[PDB]
Structure 1
Amino acid sequence: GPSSQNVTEYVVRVPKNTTKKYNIMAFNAADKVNFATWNQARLERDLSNKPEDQPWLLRVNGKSGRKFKGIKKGGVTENTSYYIFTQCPDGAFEAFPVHNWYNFTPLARHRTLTAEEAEEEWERRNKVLNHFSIMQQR
């Protein structure tokens, strides 16, 4: 059929300015990120100082869902540029420059050892007893 020899050629458009800037959101494959359960999400600048030059915090499905941290790419692309091609009804590709690159990594929604207790536990480095029971106690 036509699929074995189809040739597709489309116009390329690069608007001078776009109201919304374009970024890259990269998830590690082993994380098994799935968007079906992403009913809601919250992306905001971090507050670890407790703005434009600070990392990003993502909280999917509120506190109940997984949280991810995104850090801009340190290596600048002084000799490289990245563009994204999106399908449009007019049938012409549109290219938008990548303003920023972010790698998001998740944090488990598991109980977290308090810093004081963690220091006390490390004082007993030779934990002869099972560590799993220790985690259960906390």
Structure 2
Amino acid sequence: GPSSQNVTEYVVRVPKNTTKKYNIMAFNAADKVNFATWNQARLERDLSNKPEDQPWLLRVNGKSGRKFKGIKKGGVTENTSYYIFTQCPDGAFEAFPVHNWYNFTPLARHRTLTAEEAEEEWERRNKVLNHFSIMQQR
């Protein structure tokens, strides 16, 4: 059929100045996230610094949904480049350079052990028992 020997050739275009920036994004293979549930999102800079040189902090669906934190890529694009071919109705690819590579990681929302009480329980170096009871008291 036509699909067996399909022939495709589209023109590539590179704009010089673009008012909106691009960045590569990639979740971990084991995250197993869904995008339909992401009804609301809040992508704001972290408050731990106290601006452009700080990480972001993704907060999905307020406190109901999961939160994520990540860092910029250590490597620099001195020799490498990343281009994205955006689909358009006219069919001409529009290669777009990127500015940064980002990698957020999953975080679990639950009662977390605090540093001070961690020090308090550190006396039980290996004498600790009933791992549930560690969190039950807190």
Which interval holds the TM-score relative to the shorter structure? over 0.9
Please say which of residues 11-20 and 115-124 is displaced more in the overlay: 115-124
Provide Cα deviations, 1:33-61, integer angstroms capped at 9, x if missing partner: 21111010110111112311111100011
State whether residues 65 and 109 of structure 1, in contact with CA within 8 Å, keep that contact through their aligned partners in structure 2.
no
Q: Secondary structure at the match of 2:18?
A: coil
Provide Cα deviations, 1:89-123, integer angstroms capped at 9, x if missing partner: 11101111111100010110111122211111123
Provide Cα deviations, 1:61-101, integer angstroms capped at 9, x if missing partner: 11111111121111102110000111101110111111110
Task: Give TM-score scaled by structure 2 length.
Answer: 0.94
CA distance, structure 1, for counterparts of residue 10 and residue 73 of structure 2:
31
What displacement does 1:4 show?
0.3
Q: Secondary structure at the match of 2:49?
A: coil
Instruction: Name stretches of at least 5 consecutive residues in structure 1 with no aligned partner.
Output: none
Structure 1 segments, 4+ long, off by >2 Å, are: none
- Indicate how the Cα distance of structure 1 residues 50 and 131 shifts in structure 2: closer, same or farther if over 3 A, else same: farther
RMSD of aligned Cα (Å): 1.2
CA distance, structure 2, for counterparts of residue 52 and residue 83 of structure 1:
23
Q: Secondary structure at the match of 2:119?
A: helix
CA distance, structure 2, for counterparts of residue 123 and residue 50 of structure 1:
34
What displacement does 1:11 show?
0.6
Task: Give TM-score scaled by structure 1 length.
Answer: 0.94
- Indicate how the Cα distance of structure 1 residues 137 and 15 shifts in structure 2: closer, same or farther if over 3 A, else same: same
State whether residues 57 and 70 of structure 1, in contact with CA within 8 Å, keep that contact through their aligned partners in structure 2.
yes
Q: More strand by proportion, 1 or 2?
A: 1
Instruction: Name stretches of at least 5 consecutive residues in structure 2 with no aligned partner.
Output: none
State whether residues 64 and 109 of structure 1, in contact with CA within 8 Å, keep that contact through their aligned partners in structure 2.
no
What displacement does 1:18 show?
1.0
CA distance, structure 2, for counterparts of residue 21 and residue 27 of structure 1:
20
CA distance, structure 1, for counterparts of residue 49 and residue 123 of structure 2:
29
